[PDB]
Design a protein around this ligand. Structure first.
Ligand SMILES: [Zn+2]
Ligand SMILES: [Zn+2]
Length: 90
DNA sequence: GCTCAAGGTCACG
DNA sequence: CGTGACCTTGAGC
């Protein structure tokens, strides 16, 4: 069996594992753009923000913080960028 | 020689 | 212009 996998970033049903933890497609795409595009962000407020589906739209910075914290590793994103190279961390 | 998930690719709000 | 989400790639079992 497996649990109903959940994007533990924003708290919605994950499509599956993406970057070695359960994460939805939006979080995947963001996490890529941030790293691959070397995009800098800042919190509107204080970068002391809980992250939900709603709150992540507001705070890109806090989204990226949550992502790293829970276990979407920066190094998970290959700069080599080759599809299907599964990265369940071990 | 199938199965899982990196991750493009591009359509919608 | 930022997600949202669905097809393709292509590495592991
Ligand atoms: Zn998510
Ligand atoms: Zn914030």
């Amino acid at each position: 069996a497996i649990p109903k996998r959940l994007c533990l970033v924003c708290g919605d049903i994950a499509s599956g594992y993406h970057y070695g933890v359960a994460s939805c497609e939006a979080c995947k795409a963001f996490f890529k753009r941030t790293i691959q595009g070397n995009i800098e962000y800042s919190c509107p407020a204080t970068n002391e923000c809980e992250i939900t589906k709603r709150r992540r739209k507001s705070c890109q910075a806090c989204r990226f913080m949550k992502a790293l914290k829970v276990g979407m590793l920066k190094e998970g994103v290959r700069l080599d960028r080759v599809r299907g190279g599964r990265q369940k961390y071990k």
